[PDB]
Amino acid sequence: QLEPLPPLTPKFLNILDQVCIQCYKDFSPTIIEDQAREHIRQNLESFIRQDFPGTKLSLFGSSKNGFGFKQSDLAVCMTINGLETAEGLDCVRTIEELARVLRKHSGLRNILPITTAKVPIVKFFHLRSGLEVDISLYNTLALHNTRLLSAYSAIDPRVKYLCYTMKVFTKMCDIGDASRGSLSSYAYTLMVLYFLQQRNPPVIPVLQEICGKNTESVGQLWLGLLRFYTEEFDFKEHVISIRRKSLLTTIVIEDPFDLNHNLGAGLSRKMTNFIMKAFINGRRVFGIPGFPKDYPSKMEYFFDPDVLTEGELAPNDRCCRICGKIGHFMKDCP
Ligand SMILES: [Zn+2]
Q: Ligand 1 mean position to 319 CA, how many Å?
């Protein structure tokens, strides 16, 4: 059980609002930087068209879902006109050949074809913009997660404010990178939307079953989420599913389209405990009011890593002691 928090003063609550809103303005991309991502797509499409005529490239992921950061990886989906589907298409061979085509591009570095994962991709670094780029073939389920999240973000501005706040919180606690043992940005976003669907009154519906009645400020909702996932939610009798309103029985997070995909499947237990521990601290920092008269930056007070995680690193027992990423032993690392 947790220690109760004192009541919220309208002043401190007004400050929590500004912090949640600033998490969006400070770290979402500008319109010029989004246009720069579009220009990258156009010039890759023309370059690949030389060796794969009919190529069509589309941006998905953080680039288009309305929750991406600056310096987020640019995720590209590749299709070929006349090839309605990838049925029969040898994706590995295509990815490998694509990698060799891109090595002749003067603006790209560290071309890397990866066929390990479920979906093979080509990875490379783009110098003109300092972004990592991932090209995959016919990744339509990814483009559907994007269209779904993009729809929720446009229903209420508080959706984007909160998802960005969550994104800053997890990134600052070092618990928001799936490749290193923790949970992905997508997972933490689903936890946000799910909390908003379950809030009484609801802030967002379940678009997979089909109005502004919730009048709580973003600050109230942010702390509400921290108290929701720290005090009430039963993490192993209920499944975090934005798919529908009714509570689903068996951290478990269900992908709204791939219903066999549990986003928390690869979670250890000292990471699960480390994650929960970060939320309990956030509950304290954001819920318990010298502030504001001796702190030059409010961001640095609320998102202090030495307070949210108590000066401890994220566990990485699974991880290569050289790269720090999961997925391979210490012998086969780049
Ligand atoms: Zn490694």
A: 7
